[PDB]
Structure formats: C-alpha cells, structure tokens
XYZ file of N, CA, C and O in Angstrom:
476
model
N 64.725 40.678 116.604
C 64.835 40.738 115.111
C 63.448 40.491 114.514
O 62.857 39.580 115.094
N 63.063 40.813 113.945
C 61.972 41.029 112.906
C 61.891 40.748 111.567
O 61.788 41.675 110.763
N 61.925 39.527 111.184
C 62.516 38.556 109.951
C 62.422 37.261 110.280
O 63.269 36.439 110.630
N 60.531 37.168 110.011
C 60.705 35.496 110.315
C 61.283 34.624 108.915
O 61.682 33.469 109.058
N 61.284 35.365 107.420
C 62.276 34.985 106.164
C 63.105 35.460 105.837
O 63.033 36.191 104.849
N 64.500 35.233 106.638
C 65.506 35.749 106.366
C 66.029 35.400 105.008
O 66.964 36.105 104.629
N 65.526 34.238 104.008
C 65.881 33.857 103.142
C 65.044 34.769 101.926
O 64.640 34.175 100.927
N 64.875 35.879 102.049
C 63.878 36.369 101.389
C 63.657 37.930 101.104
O 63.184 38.642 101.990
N 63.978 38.406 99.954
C 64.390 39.628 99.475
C 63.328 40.378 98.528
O 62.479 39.704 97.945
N 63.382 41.898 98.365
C 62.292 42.091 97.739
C 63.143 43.263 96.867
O 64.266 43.468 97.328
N 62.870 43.871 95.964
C 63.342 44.924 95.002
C 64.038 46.367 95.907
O 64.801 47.171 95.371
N 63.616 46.447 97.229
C 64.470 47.526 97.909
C 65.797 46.945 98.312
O 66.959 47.266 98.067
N 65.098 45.738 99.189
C 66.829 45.480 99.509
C 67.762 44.953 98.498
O 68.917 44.611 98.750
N 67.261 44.912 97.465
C 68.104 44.415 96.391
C 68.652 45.799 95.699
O 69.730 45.890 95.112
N 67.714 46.846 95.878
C 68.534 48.456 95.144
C 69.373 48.739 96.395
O 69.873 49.862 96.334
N 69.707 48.002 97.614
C 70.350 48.297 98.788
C 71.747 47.960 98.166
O 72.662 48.662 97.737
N 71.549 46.581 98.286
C 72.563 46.058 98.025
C 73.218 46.283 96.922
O 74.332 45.788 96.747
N 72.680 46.989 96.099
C 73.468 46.972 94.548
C 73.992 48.861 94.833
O 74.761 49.403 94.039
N 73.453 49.564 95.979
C 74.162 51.196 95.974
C 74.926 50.736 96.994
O 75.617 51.697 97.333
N 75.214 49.693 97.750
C 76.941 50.209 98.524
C 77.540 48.609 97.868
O 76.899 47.570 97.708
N 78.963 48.890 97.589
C 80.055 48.533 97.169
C 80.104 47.521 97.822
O 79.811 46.421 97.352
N 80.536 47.743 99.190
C 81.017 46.314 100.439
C 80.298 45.673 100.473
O 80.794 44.557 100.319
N 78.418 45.571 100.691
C 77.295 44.643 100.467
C 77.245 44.002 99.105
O 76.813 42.854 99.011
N 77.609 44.586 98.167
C 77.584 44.004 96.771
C 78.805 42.824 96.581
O 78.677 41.696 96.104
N 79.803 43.357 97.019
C 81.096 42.744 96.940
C 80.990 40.948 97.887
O 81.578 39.906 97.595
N 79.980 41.236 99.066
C 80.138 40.313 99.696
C 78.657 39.167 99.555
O 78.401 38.128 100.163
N 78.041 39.776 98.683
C 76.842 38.790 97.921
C 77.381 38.517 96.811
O 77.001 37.571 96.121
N 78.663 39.568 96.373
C 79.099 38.535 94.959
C 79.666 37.563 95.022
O 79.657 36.571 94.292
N 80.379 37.880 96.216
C 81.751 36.634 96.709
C 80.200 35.267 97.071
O 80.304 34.386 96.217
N 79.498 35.101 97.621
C 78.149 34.587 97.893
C 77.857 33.631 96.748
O 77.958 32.408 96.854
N 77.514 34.228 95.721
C 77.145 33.815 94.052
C 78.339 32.807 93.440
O 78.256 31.729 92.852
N 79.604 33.716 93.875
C 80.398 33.160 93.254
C 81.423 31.975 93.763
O 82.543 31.720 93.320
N 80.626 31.260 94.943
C 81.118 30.418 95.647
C 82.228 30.664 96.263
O 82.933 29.655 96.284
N 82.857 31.862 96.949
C 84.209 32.041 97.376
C 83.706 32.983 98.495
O 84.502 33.913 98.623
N 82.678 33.064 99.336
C 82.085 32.988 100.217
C 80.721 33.095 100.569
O 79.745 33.124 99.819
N 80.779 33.161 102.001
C 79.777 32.316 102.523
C 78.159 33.498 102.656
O 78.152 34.714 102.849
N 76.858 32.471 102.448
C 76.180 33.215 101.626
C 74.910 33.330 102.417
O 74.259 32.293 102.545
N 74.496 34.334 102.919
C 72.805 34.722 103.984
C 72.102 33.972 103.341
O 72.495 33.230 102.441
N 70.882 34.101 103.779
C 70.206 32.987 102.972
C 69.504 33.677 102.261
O 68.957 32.952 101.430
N 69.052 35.375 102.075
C 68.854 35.674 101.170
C 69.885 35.516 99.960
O 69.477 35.409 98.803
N 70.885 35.510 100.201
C 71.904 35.424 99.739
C 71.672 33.912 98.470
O 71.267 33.929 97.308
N 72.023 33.039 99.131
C 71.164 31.737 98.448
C 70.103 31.729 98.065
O 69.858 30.709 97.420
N 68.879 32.765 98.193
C 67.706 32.320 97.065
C 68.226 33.213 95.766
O 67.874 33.025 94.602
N 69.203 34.292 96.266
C 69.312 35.226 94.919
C 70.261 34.543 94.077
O 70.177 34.622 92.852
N 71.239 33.818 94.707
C 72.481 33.523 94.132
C 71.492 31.981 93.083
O 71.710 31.830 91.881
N 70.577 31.134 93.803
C 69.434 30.487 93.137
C 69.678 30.590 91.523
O 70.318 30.036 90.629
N 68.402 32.067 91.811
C 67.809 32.450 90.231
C 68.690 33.278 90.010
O 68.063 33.882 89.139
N 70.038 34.046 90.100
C 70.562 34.649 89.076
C 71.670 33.788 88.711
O 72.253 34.223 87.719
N 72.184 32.659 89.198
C 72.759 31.402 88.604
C 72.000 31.081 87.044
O 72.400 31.317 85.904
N 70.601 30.372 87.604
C 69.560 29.942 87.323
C 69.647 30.718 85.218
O 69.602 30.231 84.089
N 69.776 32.021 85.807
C 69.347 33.332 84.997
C 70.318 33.056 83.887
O 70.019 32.792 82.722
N 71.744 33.168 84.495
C 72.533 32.885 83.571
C 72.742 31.749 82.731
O 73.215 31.825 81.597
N 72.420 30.800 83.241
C 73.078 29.341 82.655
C 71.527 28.830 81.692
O 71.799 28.162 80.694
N 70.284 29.047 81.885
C 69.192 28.563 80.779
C 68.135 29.817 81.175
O 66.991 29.546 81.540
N 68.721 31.545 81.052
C 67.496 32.523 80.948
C 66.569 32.220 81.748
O 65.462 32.294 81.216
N 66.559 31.769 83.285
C 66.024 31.312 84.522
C 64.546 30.983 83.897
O 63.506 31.642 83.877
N 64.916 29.590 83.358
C 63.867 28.793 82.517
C 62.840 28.342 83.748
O 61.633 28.115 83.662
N 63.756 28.280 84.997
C 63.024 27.672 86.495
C 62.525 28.751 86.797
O 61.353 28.587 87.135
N 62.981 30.230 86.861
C 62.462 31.430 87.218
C 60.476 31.881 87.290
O 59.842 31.867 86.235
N 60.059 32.091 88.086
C 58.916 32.704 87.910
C 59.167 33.950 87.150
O 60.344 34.292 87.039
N 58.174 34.740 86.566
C 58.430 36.450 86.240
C 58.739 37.135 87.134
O 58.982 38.265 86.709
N 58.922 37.018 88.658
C 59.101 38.394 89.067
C 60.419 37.971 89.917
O 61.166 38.815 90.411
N 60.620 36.581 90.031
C 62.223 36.297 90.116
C 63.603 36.797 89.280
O 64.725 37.224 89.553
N 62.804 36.469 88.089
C 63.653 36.746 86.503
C 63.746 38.208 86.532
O 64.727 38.748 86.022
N 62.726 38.967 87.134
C 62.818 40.601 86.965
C 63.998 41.034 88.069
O 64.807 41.937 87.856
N 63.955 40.332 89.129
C 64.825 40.385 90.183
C 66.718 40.503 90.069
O 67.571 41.328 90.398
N 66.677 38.623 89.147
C 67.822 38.416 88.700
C 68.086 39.490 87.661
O 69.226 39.947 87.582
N 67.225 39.885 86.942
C 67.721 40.918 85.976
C 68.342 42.567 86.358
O 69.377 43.189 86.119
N 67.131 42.814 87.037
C 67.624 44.115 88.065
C 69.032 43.904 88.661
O 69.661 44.926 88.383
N 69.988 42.867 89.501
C 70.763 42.620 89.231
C 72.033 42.766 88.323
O 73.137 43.300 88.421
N 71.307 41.995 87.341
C 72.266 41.586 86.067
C 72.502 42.915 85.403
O 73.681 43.177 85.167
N 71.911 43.491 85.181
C 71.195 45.513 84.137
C 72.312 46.230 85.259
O 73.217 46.878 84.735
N 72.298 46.159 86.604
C 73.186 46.958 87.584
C 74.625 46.349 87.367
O 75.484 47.229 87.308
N 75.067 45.155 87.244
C 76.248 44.754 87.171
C 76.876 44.887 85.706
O 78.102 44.818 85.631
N 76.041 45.097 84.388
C 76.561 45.373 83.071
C 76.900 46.835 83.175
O 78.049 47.064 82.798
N 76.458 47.525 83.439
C 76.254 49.189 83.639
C 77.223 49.805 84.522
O 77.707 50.904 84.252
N 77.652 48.896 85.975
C 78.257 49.173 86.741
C 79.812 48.613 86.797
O 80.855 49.257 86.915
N 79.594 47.132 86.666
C 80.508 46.128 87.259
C 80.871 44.881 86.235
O 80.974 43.660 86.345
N 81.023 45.965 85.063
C 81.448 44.412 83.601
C 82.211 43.470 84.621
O 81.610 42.563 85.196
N 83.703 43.747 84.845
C 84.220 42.888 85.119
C 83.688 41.485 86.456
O 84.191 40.371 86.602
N 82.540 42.124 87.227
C 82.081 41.027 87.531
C 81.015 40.120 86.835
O 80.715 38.927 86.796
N 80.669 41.115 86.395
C 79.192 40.376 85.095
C 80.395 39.457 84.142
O 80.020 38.449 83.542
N 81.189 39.705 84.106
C 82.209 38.772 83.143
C 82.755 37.638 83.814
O 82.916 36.555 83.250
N 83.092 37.900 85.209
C 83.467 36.278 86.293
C 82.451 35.472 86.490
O 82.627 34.351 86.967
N 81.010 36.023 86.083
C 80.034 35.556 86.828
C 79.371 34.436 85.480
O 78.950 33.296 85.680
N 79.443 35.227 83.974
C 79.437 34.446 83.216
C 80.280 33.049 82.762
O 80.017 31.917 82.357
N 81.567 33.940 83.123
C 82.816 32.977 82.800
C 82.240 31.781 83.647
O 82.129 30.708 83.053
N 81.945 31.831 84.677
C 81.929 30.549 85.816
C 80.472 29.830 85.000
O 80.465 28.600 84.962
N 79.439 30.465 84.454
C 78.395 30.187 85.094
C 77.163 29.891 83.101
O 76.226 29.092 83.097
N 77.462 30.528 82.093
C 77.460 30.411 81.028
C 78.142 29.737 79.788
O 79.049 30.362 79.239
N 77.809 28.625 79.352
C 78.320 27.370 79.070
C 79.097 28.169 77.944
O 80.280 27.840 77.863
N 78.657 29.212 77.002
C 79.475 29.378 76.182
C 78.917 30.884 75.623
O 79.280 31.343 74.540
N 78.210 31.403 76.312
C 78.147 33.031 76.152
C 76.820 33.724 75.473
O 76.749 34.650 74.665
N 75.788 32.930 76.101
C 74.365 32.773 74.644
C 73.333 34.030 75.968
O 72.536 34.909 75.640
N 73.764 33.641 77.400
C 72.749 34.194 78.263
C 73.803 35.580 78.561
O 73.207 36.644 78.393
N 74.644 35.662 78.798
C 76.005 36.954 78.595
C 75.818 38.032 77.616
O 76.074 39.167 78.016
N 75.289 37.837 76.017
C 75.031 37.901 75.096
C 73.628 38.517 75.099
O 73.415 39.707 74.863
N 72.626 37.544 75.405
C 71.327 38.091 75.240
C 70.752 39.278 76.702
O 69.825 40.079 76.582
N 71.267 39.158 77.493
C 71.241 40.162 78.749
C 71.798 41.361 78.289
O 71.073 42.355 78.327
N 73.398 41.514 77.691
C 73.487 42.972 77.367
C 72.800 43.516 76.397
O 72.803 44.741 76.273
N 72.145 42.766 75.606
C 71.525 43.258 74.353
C 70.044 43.700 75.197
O 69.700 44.866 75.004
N 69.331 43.038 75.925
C 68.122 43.647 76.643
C 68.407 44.517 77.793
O 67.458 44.816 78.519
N 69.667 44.997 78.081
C 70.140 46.088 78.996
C 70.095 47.115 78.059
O 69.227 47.949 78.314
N 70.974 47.393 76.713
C 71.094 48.029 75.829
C 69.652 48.361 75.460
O 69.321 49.461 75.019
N 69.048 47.628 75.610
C 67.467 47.740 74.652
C 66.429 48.675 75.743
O 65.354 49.190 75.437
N 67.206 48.716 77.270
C 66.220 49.274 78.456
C 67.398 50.612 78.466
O 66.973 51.446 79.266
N 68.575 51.026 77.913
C 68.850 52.301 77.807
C 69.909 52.195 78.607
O 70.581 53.207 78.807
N 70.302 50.838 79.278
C 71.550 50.355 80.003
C 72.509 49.875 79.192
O 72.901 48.708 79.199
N 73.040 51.042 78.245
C 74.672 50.449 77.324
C 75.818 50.448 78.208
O 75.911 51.285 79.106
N 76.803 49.451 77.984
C 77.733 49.363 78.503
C 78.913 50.690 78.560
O 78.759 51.453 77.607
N 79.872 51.023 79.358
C 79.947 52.467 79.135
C 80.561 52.784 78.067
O 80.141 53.645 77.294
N 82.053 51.861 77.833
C 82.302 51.467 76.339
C 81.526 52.223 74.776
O 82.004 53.008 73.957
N 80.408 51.682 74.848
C 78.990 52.266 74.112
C 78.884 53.754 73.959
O 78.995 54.521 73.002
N 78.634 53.889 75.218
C 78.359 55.378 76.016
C 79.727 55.993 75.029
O 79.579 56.668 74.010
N 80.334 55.801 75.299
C 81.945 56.564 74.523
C 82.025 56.634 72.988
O 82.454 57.479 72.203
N 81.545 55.622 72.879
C 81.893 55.903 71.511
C 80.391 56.393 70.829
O 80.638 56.601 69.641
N 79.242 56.605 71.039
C 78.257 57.365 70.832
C 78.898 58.797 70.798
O 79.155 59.491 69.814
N 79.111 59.088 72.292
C 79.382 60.636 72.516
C 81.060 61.166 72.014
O 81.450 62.293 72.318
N 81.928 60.214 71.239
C 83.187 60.064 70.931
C 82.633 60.566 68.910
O 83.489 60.601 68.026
C-alpha cells in the first residue's frame, strides 16, 4: 500500500467520493456518527462538522474550500442529507442558511429553484 496518510484527502478523492453513491453514503454514515469512519474519513467529518456548527471558524482556507466542495455537492445533489447533517449538527439554522445562499451565489440553486425559474 502506498499511503503513509491515510488520514488525508485532497480535492480528487473528494470529487471521488462525492460521483459514486455507495462511497458517499458510507462517509455520510461516517459524519453522521452511525458508522464507522477511515481516517480520512475523520479529518473530513473534522472540518465539515466544524463547517457547519461556527462556518469552520477552526478551518484553514483550503479546509473550508474542501468542507464546502462537499457541502455545494450535497445542496445540489443530496438536500435531504444536507438537511440530517444540519439537523444534527447546526444549533439553529444560521450555517444551513448561509451555505445555500453561497451555493446559490456559485450557480449551485437548489433544484426546487431550478423549477420554478424554468416553471
């Protein structure tokens, strides 16, 4: 094996993980404490915790770009988990809130949006 930081992810394997379903599904279960988590797994689950609950105030910039890439794929793709993930993890909906509005603002509207534009 060839991975002396297995705890340690970079913007490909993170567009990996966010184009197949079963890898996504099983880093969400990861995040969302209802299973068990690689250790990349745990630095991401970290700062996009982090992200949600105080706008990953602990975050460096290119962590926060990370958790966001993320977050922009799961509003666009996967409300209903971007919605378990807040529910658990956003004291009352301020970082939930300000993420779709800077998804919306990068051309990532929710599809909802999308419909009633072209509706």
């Amino acid at each position: 094996v060839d991975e002396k930081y297995p705890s340690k992810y970079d913007n490909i394997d993170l567009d990996e993980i966010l184009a197949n379903k079963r890898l996504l599904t099983a880093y969400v279960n990861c995040i969302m404490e209802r299973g068990k988590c690689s250790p990349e797994g745990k630095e991401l689950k970290e700062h996009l915790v982090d992200a949600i609950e105080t706008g990953c105030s602990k975050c460096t910039e290119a962590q926060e770009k990370g958790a966001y890439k993320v977050i922009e794929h799961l509003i666009q793709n996967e409300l209903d988990t971007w919605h378990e993930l807040t529910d658990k993890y956003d004291s009352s909906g301020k970082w939930r809130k300000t993420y779709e509005d800077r998804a919306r603002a990068n051309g990532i509207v929710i599809p909802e949006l999308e419909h009633h534009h072209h509706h």
